[PDB]
Amino acid sequence: VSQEGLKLSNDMMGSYAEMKFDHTNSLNIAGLSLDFSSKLDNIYSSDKFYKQTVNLQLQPYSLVTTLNSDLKYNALDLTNNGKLRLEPLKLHVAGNLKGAYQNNEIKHIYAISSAALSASYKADTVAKVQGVEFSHRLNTDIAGLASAIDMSTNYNSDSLHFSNVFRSVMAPFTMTIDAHTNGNGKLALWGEHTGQLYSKFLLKAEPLAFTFSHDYKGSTSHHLVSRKSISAALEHKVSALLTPAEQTGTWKLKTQFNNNEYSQDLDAYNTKDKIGVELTGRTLADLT
Amino acid sequence: HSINLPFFETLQEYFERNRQTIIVVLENVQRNLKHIKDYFEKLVGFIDDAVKKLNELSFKTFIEDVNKFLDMLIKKLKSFDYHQFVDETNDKIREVTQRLNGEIQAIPEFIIPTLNLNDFQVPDLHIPEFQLPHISHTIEVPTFGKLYSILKIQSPLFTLDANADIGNGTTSANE
């Protein structure tokens, strides 16, 4: 301890056979700034060990933090790294986390920063296990106020591949939805099962006027054993224009099973002049 | 069909009488005031503005003007663009910063990002505009004309065609 400031340094070395433990902590005090570093490594075997490294630096109007740790168990591994920079009103958080066991590995990316009093965030997660990928992405610039959302979720597999994309904005007044989903289903248990997915949803809203439309096609063919050719083909689409002066809607429902089909036609009307609905229930059926 | 009542007529008459009396009182006040010169002129202008607005005011015209401004505001809101508004906000922030700096030299700066989002998406749907029929002291009623039921059933087993219709007697109001 001196007029310059405190200094503290400590080292503890212990080892025997496969185990070696090298621990050191350097604590220095200098003026209006702090310096510290703890570099600790715990080796139990060449492929079986633990590493920790913490390094903190304090200076007027700025913070620097570094965190790096490493763990290994021969066939298994885990690593993580996180950066932290902070100064008045400015935040910058970034790093990596990665866990892996042989081929099966998971990759994660995280980066959070705040500038101009607006918070930005990006995360990326990808998993590749047993020859199957999953790609779900949360995109950048989720501000937090008058914000926006974007996403990209993708699953890939032999029996099934699924792709989902979404975008929407929560601005002060106007609203919008752009939802688009696609799924191909292939399955063979007790015959082939072709699960096809066509789902589109869109919505737009604004003061004193709302509108939307759902667009879905559902078709599935089942080639089950015993020469059973079964096709389930559902097709519904929706829409409606809404605003105080004029109001109406439409709903087209087409459903069929093999040779038997039903279709209903609906149109809803609500306007200054009139209100009315019209329905056409047409059926096709088998059997006596 | 417009529905008017004697109460509406009496309301308008009393409104007109009260407005006339208040205009007379305001003229009396202005004349007493007229009975440094920049300040006197400003006071005369204030009382004159009060008198002019009082004379302008009328209940039916007042509600009509309010409805007009409301429709204008709805049209502005529905056509509101976030990119244009964001640019306007940046302009206003720059104006405030320039002002405060001008008084300083004659403080940290404040900033807002030049945010844009139409680049990523653009609506494809069509949204009808708002429609409000004008508003006056009278009440409005679209008279009921008719109600009719149309039904058709087609099947070789059985056929139905049933019609049920009922409507209003619009030949005269007294009947």
Short mmCIF file of C-alpha atoms in Angstrom, two decimals:
data_model
loop_
_atom_site.label_atom_id
_atom_site.label_comp_id
_atom_site.label_asym_id
_atom_site.label_seq_id
_atom_site.Cartn_x
_atom_site.Cartn_y
_atom_site.Cartn_z
CA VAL A 1 0.00 0.00 0.00
CA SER A 2 1.42 3.36 -1.04
CA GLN A 3 0.33 6.88 -1.95
CA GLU A 4 0.08 5.62 -5.53
CA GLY A 5 -2.44 3.01 -4.41
CA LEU A 6 -2.87 -0.56 -3.21
CA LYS A 7 -1.23 -3.44 -5.02
CA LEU A 8 -2.21 -7.07 -4.41
CA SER A 9 -0.69 -10.04 -6.22
CA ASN A 10 -1.16 -13.67 -5.19
CA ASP A 11 -0.10 -16.96 -6.79
CA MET A 12 -1.02 -20.46 -5.59
CA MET A 13 0.58 -23.34 -7.49
CA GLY A 14 -0.47 -26.90 -6.72
CA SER A 15 0.07 -30.04 -8.78
CA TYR A 16 0.47 -33.81 -8.49
CA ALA A 17 0.21 -36.51 -11.17
CA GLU A 18 -2.42 -35.54 -13.79
CA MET A 19 -3.61 -32.53 -11.76
CA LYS A 20 -2.02 -29.08 -12.02
CA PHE A 21 -3.67 -25.94 -10.65
CA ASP A 22 -2.11 -22.60 -11.61
CA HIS A 23 -3.96 -19.70 -9.97
CA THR A 24 -2.92 -16.04 -10.00
CA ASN A 25 -4.81 -12.82 -9.25
CA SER A 26 -3.25 -9.44 -10.04
CA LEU A 27 -5.02 -6.55 -8.29
CA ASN A 28 -3.52 -3.10 -8.93
CA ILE A 29 -4.80 0.29 -7.76
CA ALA A 30 -3.67 3.39 -9.68
CA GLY A 31 -5.37 6.77 -9.45
CA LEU A 32 -8.97 6.81 -10.66
CA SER A 33 -8.63 3.48 -12.52
CA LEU A 34 -8.70 -0.17 -11.47
CA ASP A 35 -6.82 -3.05 -13.08
CA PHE A 36 -7.58 -6.68 -12.28
CA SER A 37 -6.97 -10.06 -13.88
CA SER A 38 -7.63 -13.59 -12.60
CA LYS A 39 -6.14 -16.21 -14.93
CA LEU A 40 -7.07 -19.61 -13.49
CA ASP A 41 -6.50 -22.92 -15.28
CA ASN A 42 -7.41 -26.32 -13.82
CA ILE A 43 -5.99 -29.21 -15.84
CA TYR A 44 -7.24 -32.65 -14.82
CA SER A 45 -6.11 -34.32 -18.05
CA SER A 46 -4.96 -33.14 -21.46
CA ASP A 47 -8.48 -33.51 -22.88
CA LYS A 48 -10.19 -33.09 -19.48
CA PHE A 49 -9.58 -29.64 -18.01
CA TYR A 50 -11.19 -26.33 -17.08
CA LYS A 51 -10.04 -22.81 -17.98
CA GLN A 52 -11.33 -19.55 -16.51
CA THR A 53 -10.06 -16.06 -17.37
CA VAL A 54 -11.66 -12.89 -15.98
CA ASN A 55 -10.23 -9.47 -16.82
CA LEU A 56 -11.84 -6.24 -15.59
CA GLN A 57 -10.60 -2.71 -16.26
CA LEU A 58 -12.15 0.37 -14.63
CA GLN A 59 -11.27 3.83 -15.95
CA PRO A 60 -13.09 7.18 -15.78
CA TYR A 61 -16.21 7.06 -17.98
CA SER A 62 -15.53 3.61 -19.47
CA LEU A 63 -15.92 -0.05 -18.50
CA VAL A 64 -14.16 -3.01 -20.12
CA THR A 65 -15.02 -6.59 -19.17
CA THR A 66 -13.64 -9.78 -20.73
CA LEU A 67 -14.88 -13.27 -19.85
CA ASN A 68 -13.34 -16.35 -21.47
CA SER A 69 -13.82 -19.85 -20.06
CA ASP A 70 -13.15 -23.25 -21.62
CA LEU A 71 -14.27 -26.76 -20.65
CA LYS A 72 -13.37 -30.07 -22.31
CA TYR A 73 -14.18 -33.74 -21.62
CA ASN A 74 -12.47 -35.65 -24.42
CA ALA A 75 -15.53 -36.51 -26.52
CA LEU A 76 -17.46 -33.45 -25.28
CA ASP A 77 -16.55 -29.76 -25.50
CA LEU A 78 -18.06 -26.43 -24.46
CA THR A 79 -16.81 -22.90 -25.06
CA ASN A 80 -18.24 -19.47 -24.29
CA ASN A 81 -17.09 -15.89 -24.80
CA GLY A 82 -18.86 -12.70 -23.77
CA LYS A 83 -17.76 -9.13 -24.47
CA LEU A 84 -19.10 -6.23 -22.40
CA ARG A 85 -18.35 -2.60 -23.23
CA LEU A 86 -20.31 0.08 -21.37
CA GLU A 87 -19.99 3.86 -21.28
CA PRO A 88 -22.52 6.63 -20.58
CA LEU A 89 -25.69 5.86 -22.58
CA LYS A 90 -23.79 3.53 -24.96
CA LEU A 91 -24.00 -0.24 -24.50
CA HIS A 92 -22.25 -2.87 -26.63
CA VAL A 93 -22.73 -6.52 -25.65
CA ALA A 94 -21.44 -9.27 -27.94
CA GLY A 95 -19.98 -12.74 -27.66
CA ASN A 96 -20.27 -16.38 -28.64
CA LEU A 97 -21.52 -19.60 -27.08
CA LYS A 98 -20.73 -22.95 -28.69
CA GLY A 99 -21.40 -26.46 -27.45
CA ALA A 100 -20.40 -29.53 -29.45
CA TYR A 101 -20.19 -33.31 -29.09
CA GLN A 102 -18.50 -34.95 -32.10
CA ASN A 103 -20.38 -33.85 -35.25
CA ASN A 104 -23.47 -32.67 -33.35
CA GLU A 105 -22.75 -29.01 -32.63
CA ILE A 106 -24.86 -25.95 -31.82
CA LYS A 107 -23.80 -22.45 -32.88
CA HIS A 108 -25.19 -19.36 -31.16
CA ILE A 109 -24.50 -15.68 -31.85
CA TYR A 110 -25.56 -12.84 -29.55
CA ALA A 111 -24.89 -9.12 -30.00
CA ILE A 112 -26.79 -6.39 -28.14
CA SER A 113 -25.95 -2.72 -28.62
CA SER A 114 -27.72 0.52 -27.69
CA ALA A 115 -27.05 3.79 -29.51
CA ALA A 116 -29.01 7.03 -29.91
CA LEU A 117 -31.15 5.71 -27.04
CA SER A 118 -32.41 2.98 -29.40
CA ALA A 119 -31.68 -0.64 -28.52
CA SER A 120 -30.53 -3.06 -31.22
CA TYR A 121 -30.45 -6.84 -30.79
CA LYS A 122 -29.40 -9.69 -33.08
CA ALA A 123 -29.35 -13.40 -32.27
CA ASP A 124 -28.56 -16.36 -34.53
CA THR A 125 -29.10 -19.98 -33.49
CA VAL A 126 -28.29 -22.92 -35.78
CA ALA A 127 -28.34 -26.57 -34.71
CA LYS A 128 -26.90 -29.40 -36.83
CA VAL A 129 -27.59 -32.78 -35.21
CA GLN A 130 -27.72 -36.23 -36.85
CA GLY A 131 -27.79 -34.71 -40.32
CA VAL A 132 -30.74 -32.40 -39.56
CA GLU A 133 -30.49 -28.60 -39.60
CA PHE A 134 -32.65 -26.05 -37.80
CA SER A 135 -32.22 -22.41 -38.85
CA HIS A 136 -34.25 -19.96 -36.75
CA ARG A 137 -33.05 -16.35 -36.93
CA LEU A 138 -34.21 -13.36 -34.87
CA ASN A 139 -33.20 -10.40 -36.99
CA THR A 140 -31.60 -7.09 -36.10
CA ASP A 141 -32.96 -3.76 -34.86
CA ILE A 142 -35.74 -4.66 -32.44
CA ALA A 143 -35.81 -1.06 -31.23
CA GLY A 144 -38.20 -1.47 -28.28
CA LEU A 145 -40.27 1.62 -29.11
CA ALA A 146 -42.11 2.07 -32.39
CA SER A 147 -40.39 -1.23 -33.01
CA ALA A 148 -40.41 -3.87 -35.75
CA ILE A 149 -40.15 -7.66 -35.82
CA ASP A 150 -38.58 -9.92 -38.44
CA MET A 151 -37.92 -13.65 -38.20
CA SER A 152 -36.80 -16.61 -40.31
CA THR A 153 -37.47 -20.13 -38.99
CA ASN A 154 -36.37 -23.02 -41.20
CA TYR A 155 -36.45 -26.75 -40.43
CA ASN A 156 -34.98 -29.20 -42.94
CA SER A 157 -35.43 -32.97 -42.90
CA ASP A 158 -36.01 -35.81 -45.34
CA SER A 159 -39.55 -36.57 -44.18
CA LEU A 160 -40.37 -32.89 -43.64
CA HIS A 161 -38.99 -29.49 -44.52
CA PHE A 162 -40.57 -26.41 -42.96
CA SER A 163 -39.95 -22.77 -43.90
CA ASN A 164 -41.48 -19.88 -41.96
CA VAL A 165 -40.92 -16.17 -42.61
CA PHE A 166 -42.60 -13.32 -40.72
CA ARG A 167 -42.41 -9.53 -40.80
CA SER A 168 -44.44 -6.93 -38.92
CA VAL A 169 -44.08 -3.37 -37.66
CA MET A 170 -45.63 -1.78 -34.57
CA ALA A 171 -45.26 1.85 -35.66
CA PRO A 172 -47.48 4.39 -33.85
CA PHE A 173 -50.56 4.21 -36.08
CA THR A 174 -50.47 1.76 -39.01
CA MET A 175 -50.26 -2.02 -38.62
CA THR A 176 -49.12 -4.68 -41.09
CA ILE A 177 -48.69 -8.46 -41.03
CA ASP A 178 -46.89 -10.53 -43.70
CA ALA A 179 -47.08 -14.18 -42.65
CA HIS A 180 -46.04 -16.84 -45.19
CA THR A 181 -45.67 -20.52 -44.26
CA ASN A 182 -44.76 -23.52 -46.41
CA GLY A 183 -44.54 -27.14 -45.32
CA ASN A 184 -43.97 -30.35 -47.29
CA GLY A 185 -44.80 -33.51 -45.37
CA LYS A 186 -43.45 -36.87 -46.54
CA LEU A 187 -44.11 -39.94 -44.40
CA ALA A 188 -44.33 -43.63 -45.29
CA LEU A 189 -45.67 -45.39 -42.18
CA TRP A 190 -48.53 -47.53 -43.50
CA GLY A 191 -48.26 -45.98 -46.95
CA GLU A 192 -47.06 -42.61 -48.17
CA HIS A 193 -48.47 -39.50 -46.48
CA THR A 194 -47.88 -36.37 -48.58
CA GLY A 195 -48.56 -33.59 -46.10
CA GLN A 196 -48.59 -30.37 -48.13
CA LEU A 197 -48.94 -27.00 -46.37
CA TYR A 198 -49.80 -23.70 -48.05
CA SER A 199 -50.62 -21.08 -45.41
CA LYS A 200 -50.49 -17.34 -46.13
CA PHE A 201 -51.84 -14.69 -43.77
CA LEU A 202 -51.78 -10.93 -44.35
CA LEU A 203 -53.28 -8.17 -42.21
CA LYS A 204 -53.25 -4.38 -42.55
CA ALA A 205 -54.91 -1.92 -40.17
CA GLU A 206 -55.10 1.86 -39.87
CA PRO A 207 -57.31 4.46 -38.15
CA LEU A 208 -61.02 3.87 -38.84
CA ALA A 209 -60.34 1.17 -41.44
CA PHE A 210 -59.32 -2.47 -41.08
CA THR A 211 -58.82 -5.21 -43.64
CA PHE A 212 -57.26 -8.65 -43.90
CA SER A 213 -57.23 -11.87 -45.89
CA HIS A 214 -56.31 -15.45 -45.06
CA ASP A 215 -55.09 -17.64 -47.92
CA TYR A 216 -54.72 -21.33 -47.04
CA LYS A 217 -54.62 -24.45 -49.20
CA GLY A 218 -54.62 -27.82 -47.45
CA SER A 219 -53.97 -30.96 -49.49
CA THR A 220 -52.87 -34.35 -48.17
CA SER A 221 -52.79 -37.64 -50.08
CA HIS A 222 -52.52 -40.92 -48.16
CA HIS A 223 -51.48 -43.99 -50.18
CA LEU A 224 -52.18 -46.36 -47.31
CA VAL A 225 -51.69 -50.10 -47.57
CA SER A 226 -54.64 -52.04 -49.00
CA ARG A 227 -54.58 -49.88 -52.15
CA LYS A 228 -56.25 -47.00 -50.31
CA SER A 229 -55.83 -43.74 -52.24
CA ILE A 230 -57.11 -41.06 -49.85
CA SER A 231 -56.80 -37.38 -50.77
CA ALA A 232 -57.81 -34.72 -48.23
CA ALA A 233 -57.94 -31.40 -50.10
CA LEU A 234 -59.13 -28.53 -47.89
CA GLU A 235 -59.02 -25.03 -49.40
CA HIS A 236 -60.28 -21.99 -47.48
CA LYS A 237 -59.57 -18.33 -48.20
CA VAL A 238 -60.86 -15.41 -46.14
CA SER A 239 -61.16 -11.65 -46.56
CA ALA A 240 -63.14 -8.70 -45.26
CA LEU A 241 -63.01 -4.93 -45.81
CA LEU A 242 -63.91 -3.12 -42.59
CA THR A 243 -64.55 0.59 -42.05
CA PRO A 244 -67.44 2.48 -40.42
CA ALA A 245 -69.19 3.51 -43.65
CA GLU A 246 -68.92 0.18 -45.51
CA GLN A 247 -68.55 -3.31 -44.05
CA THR A 248 -68.47 -6.66 -45.83
CA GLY A 249 -66.66 -9.97 -45.92
CA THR A 250 -66.11 -13.11 -47.97
CA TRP A 251 -65.29 -16.72 -47.11
CA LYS A 252 -64.62 -19.36 -49.77
CA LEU A 253 -64.59 -22.86 -48.27
CA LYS A 254 -63.77 -25.77 -50.60
CA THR A 255 -63.51 -29.20 -48.96
CA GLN A 256 -63.43 -32.59 -50.67
CA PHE A 257 -62.72 -36.20 -49.68
CA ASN A 258 -62.06 -38.59 -52.57
CA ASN A 259 -65.20 -38.38 -54.73
CA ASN A 260 -67.29 -36.53 -52.12
CA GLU A 261 -67.05 -32.74 -52.09
CA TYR A 262 -68.81 -29.82 -50.43
CA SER A 263 -68.42 -26.14 -51.29
CA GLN A 264 -70.05 -23.16 -49.58
CA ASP A 265 -70.02 -19.60 -50.93
CA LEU A 266 -70.46 -16.83 -48.35
CA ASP A 267 -70.53 -13.06 -48.84
CA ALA A 268 -71.44 -10.74 -45.95
CA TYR A 269 -72.72 -7.26 -46.77
CA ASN A 270 -73.28 -4.33 -44.41
CA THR A 271 -73.55 -0.86 -45.94
CA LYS A 272 -75.71 2.27 -45.73
CA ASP A 273 -78.05 0.95 -48.42
CA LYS A 274 -78.46 -2.67 -47.37
CA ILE A 275 -77.42 -5.61 -45.21
CA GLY A 276 -77.63 -9.16 -46.51
CA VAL A 277 -75.90 -12.51 -46.91
CA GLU A 278 -75.99 -15.18 -49.61
CA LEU A 279 -75.27 -18.88 -49.16
CA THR A 280 -74.87 -21.71 -51.70
CA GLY A 281 -74.53 -25.11 -50.05
CA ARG A 282 -73.64 -27.64 -52.75
CA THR A 283 -72.81 -31.23 -51.83
CA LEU A 284 -71.58 -34.33 -53.65
CA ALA A 285 -72.01 -37.63 -51.80
CA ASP A 286 -71.69 -41.36 -52.51
CA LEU A 287 -73.39 -44.48 -51.13
CA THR A 288 -77.07 -45.40 -51.46
CA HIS B 1 -85.01 11.11 -44.45
CA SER B 2 -84.37 14.11 -42.20
CA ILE B 3 -86.10 14.26 -38.81
CA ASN B 4 -86.55 17.80 -37.48
CA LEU B 5 -88.32 18.76 -34.26
CA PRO B 6 -89.78 21.98 -32.83
CA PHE B 7 -87.20 21.62 -30.07
CA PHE B 8 -84.48 22.06 -32.70
CA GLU B 9 -86.17 25.22 -33.97
CA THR B 10 -86.48 26.69 -30.48
CA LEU B 11 -82.87 25.72 -29.77
CA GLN B 12 -81.66 27.55 -32.87
CA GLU B 13 -83.81 30.59 -32.08
CA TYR B 14 -82.54 30.85 -28.50
CA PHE B 15 -78.97 30.24 -29.68
CA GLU B 16 -79.30 33.12 -32.14
CA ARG B 17 -80.82 35.41 -29.50
CA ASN B 18 -78.09 34.64 -26.98
CA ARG B 19 -75.35 35.10 -29.58
CA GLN B 20 -76.83 38.48 -30.54
CA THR B 21 -77.01 39.62 -26.92
CA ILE B 22 -73.44 38.48 -26.24
CA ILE B 23 -72.25 40.27 -29.39
CA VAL B 24 -73.95 43.42 -28.10
CA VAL B 25 -72.22 43.02 -24.73
CA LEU B 26 -68.86 42.47 -26.44
CA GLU B 27 -69.36 45.60 -28.53
CA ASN B 28 -70.17 47.50 -25.34
CA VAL B 29 -66.96 46.19 -23.77
CA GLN B 30 -64.89 47.15 -26.83
CA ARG B 31 -66.39 50.64 -26.90
CA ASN B 32 -65.70 51.08 -23.18
CA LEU B 33 -62.11 49.95 -23.73
CA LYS B 34 -61.61 52.40 -26.60
CA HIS B 35 -63.34 55.10 -24.54
CA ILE B 36 -48.48 51.97 -24.96
CA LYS B 37 -50.45 52.50 -28.18
CA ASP B 38 -49.26 49.12 -29.46
CA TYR B 39 -50.70 47.49 -26.33
CA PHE B 40 -53.98 49.36 -26.78
CA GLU B 41 -54.12 48.22 -30.41
CA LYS B 42 -53.44 44.63 -29.34
CA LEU B 43 -56.27 44.76 -26.79
CA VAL B 44 -58.62 46.21 -29.42
CA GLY B 45 -57.57 43.43 -31.79
CA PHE B 46 -58.24 40.77 -29.16
CA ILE B 47 -61.74 42.08 -28.43
CA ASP B 48 -62.38 42.43 -32.17
CA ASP B 49 -61.31 38.81 -32.72
CA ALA B 50 -63.68 37.74 -29.95
CA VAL B 51 -66.56 39.66 -31.55
CA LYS B 52 -65.77 38.31 -35.02
CA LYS B 53 -65.61 34.70 -33.85
CA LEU B 54 -68.81 35.12 -31.83
CA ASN B 55 -70.62 36.48 -34.89
CA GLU B 56 -69.20 33.67 -37.02
CA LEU B 57 -70.30 30.97 -34.57
CA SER B 58 -73.52 29.08 -35.23
CA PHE B 59 -74.53 25.70 -33.83
CA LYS B 60 -75.22 23.99 -37.16
CA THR B 61 -72.20 25.65 -38.77
CA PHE B 62 -70.10 24.88 -35.69
CA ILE B 63 -70.88 21.16 -35.83
CA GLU B 64 -70.38 21.21 -39.60
CA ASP B 65 -66.93 22.78 -39.20
CA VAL B 66 -66.01 20.30 -36.47
CA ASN B 67 -67.07 17.39 -38.69
CA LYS B 68 -65.09 18.87 -41.58
CA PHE B 69 -61.93 19.15 -39.48
CA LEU B 70 -62.44 15.64 -38.12
CA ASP B 71 -62.76 14.23 -41.64
CA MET B 72 -59.62 16.13 -42.65
CA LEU B 73 -57.78 14.71 -39.64
CA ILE B 74 -58.92 11.18 -40.47
CA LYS B 75 -57.75 11.60 -44.06
CA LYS B 76 -54.38 12.87 -42.81
CA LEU B 77 -54.01 9.98 -40.34
CA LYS B 78 -54.95 7.26 -42.83
CA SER B 79 -52.43 8.68 -45.32
CA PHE B 80 -49.84 9.06 -42.55
CA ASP B 81 -46.38 7.86 -43.60
CA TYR B 82 -43.84 6.86 -40.97
CA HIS B 83 -40.82 7.69 -43.13
CA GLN B 84 -42.05 11.22 -43.83
CA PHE B 85 -42.99 11.68 -40.18
CA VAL B 86 -39.58 10.38 -39.07
CA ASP B 87 -37.88 12.87 -41.38
CA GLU B 88 -40.11 15.61 -39.94
CA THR B 89 -39.09 14.51 -36.44
CA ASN B 90 -35.42 14.68 -37.45
CA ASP B 91 -36.07 18.18 -38.81
CA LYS B 92 -37.70 19.22 -35.53
CA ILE B 93 -34.89 17.73 -33.42
CA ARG B 94 -32.34 19.57 -35.56
CA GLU B 95 -34.38 22.76 -35.16
CA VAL B 96 -34.44 22.38 -31.37
CA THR B 97 -30.70 21.67 -31.26
CA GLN B 98 -29.95 24.65 -33.50
CA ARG B 99 -32.16 26.87 -31.35
CA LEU B 100 -30.69 25.90 -27.98
CA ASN B 101 -27.20 26.23 -29.46
CA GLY B 102 -28.12 29.67 -30.79
CA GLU B 103 -29.15 30.85 -27.34
CA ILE B 104 -25.98 29.31 -25.89
CA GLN B 105 -23.65 31.27 -28.17
CA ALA B 106 -25.87 34.35 -28.60
CA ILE B 107 -25.42 21.48 -23.40
CA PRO B 108 -25.16 18.04 -25.05
CA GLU B 109 -26.95 17.44 -28.33
CA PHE B 110 -30.02 15.25 -28.80
CA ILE B 111 -30.39 13.01 -31.84
CA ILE B 112 -33.01 10.71 -33.35
CA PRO B 113 -32.10 8.12 -36.03
CA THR B 114 -33.23 8.48 -39.64
CA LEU B 115 -35.31 5.33 -39.37
CA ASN B 116 -36.96 3.73 -42.41
CA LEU B 117 -39.04 0.56 -42.68
CA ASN B 118 -40.99 0.77 -45.96
CA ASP B 119 -37.88 -0.67 -47.62
CA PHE B 120 -38.54 -4.07 -46.03
CA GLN B 121 -42.28 -4.27 -46.76
CA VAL B 122 -44.99 -2.40 -48.64
CA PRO B 123 -48.72 -3.17 -48.23
CA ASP B 124 -50.35 -4.71 -51.30
CA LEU B 125 -53.94 -4.53 -50.05
CA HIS B 126 -56.31 -1.63 -50.72
CA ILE B 127 -57.94 0.19 -47.80
CA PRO B 128 -61.06 2.27 -48.59
CA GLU B 129 -61.09 5.85 -47.34
CA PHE B 130 -63.29 7.03 -44.48
CA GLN B 131 -66.75 8.40 -45.31
CA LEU B 132 -68.92 10.34 -42.86
CA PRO B 133 -72.06 12.06 -44.22
CA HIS B 134 -72.16 15.68 -43.09
CA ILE B 135 -73.71 16.59 -39.72
CA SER B 136 -76.25 19.36 -39.14
CA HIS B 137 -78.76 20.23 -36.43
CA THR B 138 -81.21 17.81 -38.08
CA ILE B 139 -81.34 14.04 -37.61
CA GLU B 140 -80.88 11.68 -40.56
CA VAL B 141 -82.70 8.39 -41.15
CA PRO B 142 -82.50 6.06 -44.19
CA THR B 143 -86.06 4.78 -44.32
CA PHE B 144 -86.62 1.03 -44.41
CA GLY B 145 -87.99 -0.08 -47.77
CA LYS B 146 -88.35 -3.86 -47.96
CA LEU B 147 -87.35 -7.25 -46.57
CA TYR B 148 -87.39 -10.32 -48.81
CA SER B 149 -86.28 -13.93 -48.39
CA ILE B 150 -85.06 -15.92 -51.39
CA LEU B 151 -84.56 -19.66 -50.89
CA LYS B 152 -83.83 -22.40 -53.42
CA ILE B 153 -83.19 -26.12 -52.85
CA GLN B 154 -82.12 -28.40 -55.71
CA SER B 155 -82.13 -32.18 -55.32
CA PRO B 156 -83.88 -34.86 -57.41
CA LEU B 157 -85.35 -36.22 -54.18
CA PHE B 158 -87.17 -32.94 -53.48
CA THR B 159 -87.38 -29.38 -54.80
CA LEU B 160 -88.22 -26.29 -52.76
CA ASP B 161 -88.55 -22.65 -53.79
CA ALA B 162 -89.88 -20.55 -50.91
CA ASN B 163 -90.15 -16.75 -50.96
CA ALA B 164 -91.10 -14.60 -47.96
CA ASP B 165 -91.18 -10.82 -48.42
CA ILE B 166 -92.34 -7.96 -46.20
CA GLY B 167 -91.76 -4.24 -46.45
CA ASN B 168 -92.75 -0.80 -45.24
CA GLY B 169 -95.72 1.25 -46.37
CA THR B 170 -93.96 4.26 -47.88
CA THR B 171 -96.93 5.69 -49.80
CA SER B 172 -97.37 8.47 -47.23
CA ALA B 173 -96.01 9.47 -43.84
CA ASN B 174 -99.44 10.00 -42.25
CA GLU B 175 -100.39 6.38 -43.04
#
